[PDB]
């Protein structure tokens, strides 16, 4: 009957959250009851989901997390379930969905309460004595986990991407784009950069703004950027002012009409410092939106392979981003080709079936 799903936070505008939601919904369609344990739930509660919001408190997140696992475990001890699936690393998981990269790997780039907590919770999952089954979405991170923990090969299962169908370009894409461009006041010659997804700092909004500001006068004048995410705009409001970008940048809060932004824009810019996968890279691809992304992103290879944009090699060089942005925007035939390529690729590649493959592994 019952499946316990565990994640620290539910909200609709996150990739971890949307993956969780598509997996929970697929399990519910196969006959199972759905219980969710969480620190917060924003937005509607689907019909039939029992959502338990933990009442635990602590000034430090890592300590909040520890009290959360105690609270959750008490409840399961009293009201058991058939399988426990986590979206965050912690003890007590039968299945862990690897929405984060390897923490130990990034920590080596230690007496802290934070570090100790996060490595201990990673180890609880990945230590060879753990029974946790792991659903991988970044192929590249599996050897990093093995390197740090010695995790058994037979415990890892790689899933395809899980892009939702509404991201796919519709038969009326031209009109959706036209209506979006009207609403935002973008002419045929205007160029729109979009930076999409919460966590602007890690996803490199500071680098995107610098590249926009560094453009040649002729392109700079025609170009604007919209960032969309739940983050506090205020640290970026200062950067935007200092680069003189007040009249050509907007930062919006989370929205549920992302496909309109992907159809209406001219380039997705994603110069992330680090990124486990990069859902929005693939969402741009299926919408025929050209991408500019750093090679550090786990899904950047899809952009190279589909020939749907340009991947910036490491090590990161602001000068190299600046030049590559200007070349992509100056090259209109190249953008048209990147666009066609992404749409052709989206029609034959499996970028969709994650939730069914995940549900198969969770359930048999
Ligand atoms: O305002 C927003 C920001 C992101 N998102 C979605 O959240 C996901 C972000 O992916 P990520 O967490 O893997 O970076 C992706 O599917 C976006 O389309 C929204 O739906 N609305």
Numbering used by the authors: 1 to 109, 116 to 370
Question: What does the paper behind this entry write?
Answer:
The glycosyltransferase WaaG in Pseudomonas aeruginosa (PaWaaG) is involved in the synthesis of the core region of lipopolysaccharides. The hexosyl sugar residue in each of the bacterial species is transferred by a glycosyltransferase (GT) referred to as WaaG to form an α-(1→3)-linkage. The PaWaaG monomer displays a typical GT-B fold, consisting of two “Rossmann-like” β/α/β domains.
